[PDB]
């Protein structure tokens, strides 16, 4: 059922920089996001080339955004190729670790936060903007799960029983701090996906909730 898992120390160390850190341009964290998501898509594509049936479970290839105000939650969603509970706990942790060593040598040597990409470990970078997130999971051949974080030493896995079925892919669901709920507004996640992912190969689509004036 759920499963706790401590972050090494080091992992606890960067997550707690990023949190922390005021970095001027924190909206990196979202081209960072949607670069994992182009990233899981092209790797269903790819192996569907050669195995049309990896689709059946969702065939269309997509990014989807999903401001809930009243949650002050700020949702990803694709249908890439998912990740499954051995991802989740171990497989991630040791790419997670090795790219957060790299990470910091370059931090310690000059490197920015918006370099973090280049390491492996861009997930991370949503503490920029968020202290809670929520990682919805279907892969292939594996359950539903739900990854849970709140950037300190602890994370949690569960078994999925109360959201919607994914079909297959990736749901993140960031819980936006205080001071950075802009990212709730549909101007301007507009305007940082069209500055900071120019070149993606699959739809960004924007989920928007407006009342109507009667
Ligand atoms: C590249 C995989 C990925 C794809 C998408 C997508 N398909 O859109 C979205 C997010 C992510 N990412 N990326 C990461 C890390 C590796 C950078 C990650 C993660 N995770 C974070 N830390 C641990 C951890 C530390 N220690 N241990 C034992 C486990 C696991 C948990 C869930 N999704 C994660």
Do not use: C
């Not at 960067?14 to 670069?35: H, Q």
């Not at 002050?72 to 990740?83: F, Q, T, W």
């Not at 940082?192 to 009667?214: C, D, G, M, N, R």
């Amino acid at each position: 059922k759920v499963e706790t898992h401590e972050f090494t120390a080091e992992i606890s160390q960067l997550m707690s920089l990023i949190i922390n850190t005021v970095y001027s341009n924190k909206e990196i964290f979202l081209r960072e996001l949607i670069s994992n998501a182009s990233d899981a898509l092209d790797k269903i594509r790819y192996q569907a080339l050669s195995d049309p049936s990896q689709l059946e479970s969702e065939p269309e290839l997509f990014i989807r955004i999903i401001p809930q105000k009243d949650q002050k939650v700020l949702e990803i969603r694709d249908s890439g190729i998912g990740m499954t509970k051995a991802d989740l706990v171990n497989n991630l942790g040791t790419i997670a670790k090795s790219g957060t060593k790299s990470f910091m040598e370059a931090l310690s040597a000059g490197a920015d936060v918006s370099m973090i990409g280049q390491f492996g470990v861009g997930f991370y970078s949503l503490f920029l903007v968020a202290d809670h997130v929520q990682v919805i999971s279907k892969h292939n051949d594996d359950e539903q799960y739900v990854w849970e974080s709140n950037a300190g030493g602890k994370f949690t896995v569960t078994l999925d029983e109360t959201n919607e079925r994914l079909g297959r892919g990736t749901m993140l669901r960031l819980f936006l701090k205080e001071d950075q709920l802009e990212y709730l507004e549909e101007k301007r996640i507009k305007e940082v996906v069209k500055k900071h992912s120019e070149f993606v190969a699959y739809p960004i689509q924007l989920v928007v909730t407006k009342e109507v004036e009667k």
